[PDB]
Design a binder for this molecule. Structure first.
Ligand SMILES: *C(=O)/C=C/c1ccc(O)cc1
Length: 125
């Protein structure tokens, strides 16, 4: 297993070195989005939590296609405020309930070290 703790202060530096295969060794869900919300990376732990097949969601828009329950001021609204500002670091609890059993999770959104990319980390609560 890859040893990185959910919510670590330097998580973006640690994950910058990770290929899709190493991202799959994380103890929590990790999704990398571009500024428009398109999925660039989606790890195995995230698929375990949500039921989505990782390879199938890459390239889809997270807010429009995959996760409509997140299209709200409380999730997507925070993401879009962060992209526009060029800075994002927020953690909050949320319930995923689209085409799945309602599941309570802790979400951490953070701007990646890379230019136009943002991370969404997820763990069960
Ligand atoms: C609500 O529509 C949430 C859906 C969802 C959350 C996280 C995922 O990775 C996939 C779908």
């Amino acid at each position: 297993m890859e040893h990185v703790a959910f919510g670590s202060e330097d998580i973006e530096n640690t994950l910058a070195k990770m290929d899709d295969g190493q991202l799959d060794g994380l103890a929590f869900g990790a999704i990398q989005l571009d500024g428009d919300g398109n999925i660039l990376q989606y790890n195995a732990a995230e698929g375990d939590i949500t039921g989505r097949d990782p390879k199938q969601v890459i390239g889809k828009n997270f807010f429009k296609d995959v996760a409509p329950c997140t299209d709200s001021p409380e999730f997507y609204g925070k993401f879009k405020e962060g992209v526009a500002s060029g800075n994002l670091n927020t953690m909050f609890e949320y319930t995923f309930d689209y085409q799945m059993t309602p599941t309570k999770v802790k979400v951490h959104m953070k701007k990646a070290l890379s230019g136009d990319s943002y991370w969404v980390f997820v763990k069960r609560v």
